[PDB]
UniProtKB/Swiss-Prot annotation:
This gene is located in a region of chromosome 16 that contains 2 segmental duplications. Other genes that are highly related to this exist, but they probably represent pseudogenes. HEAT repeats lie at residues 210-245. Residues 411-417 are annotated as: G-loop. Belongs to the PI3/PI4-kinase family. The chain holds residues 1529 to 2138 of 3661 of the full protein. It comes from Homo sapiens (Human). Serine/threonine protein kinase involved in both mRNA surveillance and genotoxic stress response pathways. Recognizes the substrate consensus sequence [ST]-Q. Plays a central role in nonsense-mediated decay (NMD) of mRNAs containing premature stop codons by phosphorylating UPF1/RENT1. Recruited by release factors to stalled ribosomes together with SMG8 and SMG9 (forming the SMG1C protein kinase complex), and UPF1 to form the transient SURF (SMG1-UPF1-eRF1-eRF3) complex. It is found in: Nucleus; Cytoplasm. This is Serine/threonine-protein kinase SMG1.
Length: 419
């Protein structure tokens, strides 16, 4: 097949002749024809002839032959799957005898032609189809429409089955192929969900969890699809992947947990993950909350607010901002409260404005670095013998648990001054 693809300019004629002879020739032509008709999830010309060229059909048939004769090699499945997907993407885009007889018998000259044209003119699609039929003709039309719609997705069905089988076999191939197959399957499940849900709904319930460990963010981002079974399937897959591999859906799911579609799924995912080790889940949640609290100290927030207020001074907005800042701020906590506890009193006295300038100057002078874990957050200190995972261990067969946290925290002397 690779050699045929290389010399596609001088091999198209032979393939066309072979195809013509099949539906009714040098040594190579007769040899390929004989190999194709070997006696033995199938390819039929009644559906692949909606845009696919005649010589292009021989390649697909050869790939199918390789997959049927060698059901253990993943390369054969990958090749057949890629060909089916590539041609399906084009036939569907370009598309958007027994049928005519069935329609005529069920609906027993220009009317028939108009009805036939409207049955596949552009095939919430049910409402549009009904409106078009009523406006054109004016029931068996629904059956014909569903049959033709399901028939057009033959290539997609074959590609889906091939990808599922290939992934199952690789439960041996480069990670690039696995990533490409997973991305293509996800795109097929999102773009065309209801058109071929009968295949994805069943395929997603038996694939392993290892091949789906590289596109987790994509799965999480696609949780708000305007569908019902799509979100449920994604949530089930994520929950299944959580088992035996919790260090991959731990931080994203917990961070997201702290429209209801973007929250309900996260709730069930975190619940399923916590059904095994609830103590670890609660500990990581508390750790995340503590980190968020220690992110920006009250001193830095107050200094920034004072600077912004002073810059925007040259009213109601200033008073509201000051009140909100004071309300948000009610070892380090007690020290700040006892060192700058007159801010509320000063603001109230000045309400009826040197207090703001004095506070800003004092904060700026006190800003000019070493911090202690006990003073910053007592929860972080004394933490030990924890089975939590490190923040980011995508490629780690033997995950390393956090033993302790450094007691000294420094700050960079940059614009944002990170910790």
């Amino acid at each position: 097949a690779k050699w045929i693809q290389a010399e596609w300019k001088e091999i198209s004629g032979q393939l066309k002749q072979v195809y013509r002879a099949q539906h009714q020739l040098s040594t190579l032509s007769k040899n390929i024809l004989t190999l194709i008709e070997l006696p033995s999830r199938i390819e039929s010309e009644s559906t692949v002839h909606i845009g696919v060229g005649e010589p292009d059909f021989i390649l697909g048939q050869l790939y199918h032959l390789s997959s049927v004769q060698a059901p253990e090699v993943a390369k054969s499945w990958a090749a057949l799957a890629s060909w089916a997907y590539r041609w399906g993407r084009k036939v569907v885009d370009n598309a958007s005898x027994x049928x005519x007889x069935x329609x005529x018998x069920x609906x027993x000259x220009x009317x028939x032609x108009x009805x036939x044209x409207x049955x596949x003119x552009x095939x919430x699609x049910x409402x549009x189809x009904x409106x078009x039929x009523x406006x054109x003709x004016x029931e068996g039309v629904i059956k014909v429409w569903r049959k033709v719609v399901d028939r057009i997705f033959s290539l997609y069905k074959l590609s889906c089955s091939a990808y599922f089988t290939f992934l199952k076999l690789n439960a041996q191939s480069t990670d690039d192929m696995i990533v490409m197959a997973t991305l293509r399957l996800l795109r097929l499940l999102v773009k065309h969900a209801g058109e071929l849900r009968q295949y994805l709904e069943h395929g997603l319930e038996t694939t392993p969890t290892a091949p789906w460990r590289g596109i987790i963010p994509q799965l999480f981002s696609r949780l708000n699809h305007p569908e019902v079974y799509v979100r449920q399937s994604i949530c089930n897959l994520l929950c299944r992947v959580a088992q035996d591999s919790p260090h991959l859906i731990l931080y994203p799911a917990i961070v997201g947990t702290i429209q209801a579609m973007m929250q309900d799924c996260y709730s069930k995912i975190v619940d399923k993950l916590s059904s095994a080790n609830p103590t670890m889940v609660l500990q990581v949640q508390m750790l995340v909350a503590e980190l968020r609290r220690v992110t920006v100290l009250w001193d830095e927030l107050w200094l920034g607010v004072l600077l912004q207020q002073h810059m925007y001074v040259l009213x109601x907005x200033x008073x509201x901002x000051x009140x909100x800042x004071x309300x948000x701020x009610x070892p380090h906590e007690k020290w700040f409260q006892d060192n700058y506890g007159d801010a509320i009193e000063n603001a109230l006295e000045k309400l009826k404005x040197x207090x703001x300038x004095x506070x800003x100057x004092x904060x700026x002078x006190x800003x000019x670095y070493i911090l202690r874990l006990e003073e910053i957050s007592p929860w972080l200190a004394a933490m030990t013998n924890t089975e939590i995972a490190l923040p980011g261990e995508v490629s780690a067969r033997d995950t390393v648990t956090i033993h302790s946290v450094g007691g000294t925290i420094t700050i960079l002397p940059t614009k944002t001054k990170p910790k």
